[model samples]
Target: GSKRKVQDEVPWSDSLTAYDNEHFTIYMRLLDASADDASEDEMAQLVLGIDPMREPERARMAVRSHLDRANWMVTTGYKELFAR
Candidate 1:
């Protein structure tokens, strides 16, 4: 008996699997650039077509997914590859 509402859940998408570290870094950097006065299109180029300021929730979810992937990489020894 799950107590959560369906609206509280996030839908899984195939596009999510396409996210990677390079795009994740670009997204964050673009977010920062926008905060410093960069235009929407300028940030869009860095994020590879995402419009963060216009779609805040999508941006948040993408960043969260990126963090989860990075955490998995660190916890599962992928991070060790660079250390050797």
Candidate 2:
């Protein structure tokens, strides 16, 4: 399972889900790319494997949703990992 299948929008909840467990690497990559100020288009293309040029709206949604959850993972969701 080296390659991950990404959803157009990450499914988010108050606590962890199977989605989060499967996407931990992706979340870390999204967070790192954001921290480095990498272009969202590039991250969408490379990290999420979405083609920004081909699917602009989907690409934007993917990047925004993934990054939102990535931020949440560090700021809040990580706690659930330990609490469980």
Candidate 3:
């Protein structure tokens, strides 16, 4: 899709803050997309709105990196982000 990439580098073990609040939707979309085995091309447009099909290497890095972050969110429920 696109190469614009999002804030997928957020530290998982660290606290979640307003820093990523804006990208939450994109992050959620990515998590689901990966689960559904969605393709990267549509992901670029659907998530970051960039078409990085030609630059797959970079695209994969960004998406794959973010996916890891998303996975962390899933497993942790972002406990580091809020108070109980």
Candidate 4:
């Protein structure tokens, strides 16, 4: 089996067949975590269950990528998805 990669061009589009509605809430929670100034280590541990201290790049990039998608959702994804 293979893992899915985040699409750079449209990472947060609800149109994606794999876009689970549950993830939308998770995205919002992630966005809140970021807004609250939660550290990547904390979010990486809680949100992803990985210890950033043990695996730096992997955890850092994981939180970063998820946050980026969360940003896209708030800034553009809703506008695009809700308009349809």
Candidate 5:
């Protein structure tokens, strides 16, 4: 489960390059772990590339990319779990 605070001050621009739910989740995790010295804007740029206000499809693509990576990890033995 996750949550996103709406930015009322910054009008939601239909920008494609903005950080979507998936990217935001990753960014928050990194921020919480202090793994990378990345700012919100920087993280958004890293994940979304081009101006998010310009390309929204990238958000969906990013989510897919992350899921694919996770799937690979599980398949490759990088992650393992067992059911009780």
Candidate 6:
């Protein structure tokens, strides 16, 4: 099996990015995970594939960055897509 590598930080721009295109599914999942009030540890483990116990800071930051990007997509990033 192959693993999707999770970046410590999401590459961001004022416009849509190839990374965004590739990770839209991850964004949606993060949003849903947030809506369910899932713990960051759980999200890190399940969604981002980072083991919280082994790499706590990496797990935390990845979850935070991606979830923030997911929210940005809801608030603004999707507009770029809609404009197309």
Q: Pick the candidate with the highest lDDT.
A: 6
Query: Looking at model 3, which ten-residue stretch has the lowest summed lDDT?
Result: 2-11
Summarize candidate 5's per-residue lDDT along 1-83 as a digit string, tens digits: 24332321221245323544435445334333223554434544565352456544453444344433333334443334422
CA displacement after TM-score superposition, residue 48 of candidate 4 (Å): 1.1
lDDT tens digits, residue span 1-84, model 4: 263444312244445335444465666666677677888888877776768776665666767766776767665554655565
| Comparison by TM-score, 2 against 3, better one | 2
lDDT of 2 by residue, 1-84 (tens): 653445567776556567657877877788677777778888788777878887767777778787887877675544655565
Q: Over 4 Å off in model 4, which ranges?
A: 1-22, 76-84
User: Against the unseen true structure, what C-alpha lDDT does each candidate score?
Assistant: 0.44, 0.73, 0.64, 0.63, 0.39, 0.73
Model 5 TM-score is: 0.27
Give the candidate order by descending TM-score: 6, 2, 4, 3, 1, 5
Ten-residue stretch with the least lDDT total in model 5: 3-12
Candidate 2 clash total?
A: 0
Candidate 1 lDDT, tens digit per residue, 4-77? 22221122454443334335454445445445565545544354355676655544444444434433344543
Regions of model 6 farther than 4 Å from truth: 1-6, 13-16, 76-84
Q: Tens digit of lDDT per residue, candidate 3, span 1-84?
A: 554554435545666667775676667778777677867666655665556756555566557767667756676554655436
lDDT of 5 at 32: 35
Error of 6 at 8 (Å): 1.4
**After superposing candidate 2, which stretches have Cα over 4 Å from the reference?**
1-6, 13-16, 76-84
| Shift of residue 36 alpha carbon in model 2, Å | 1.4
TM-score of each predicted structure versus truth? 0.32, 0.66, 0.53, 0.56, 0.27, 0.66
Error of 6 at 58 (Å): 1.5
Q: Which ten residues in a row have the lowest lDDT in candidate 1?
A: 3-12
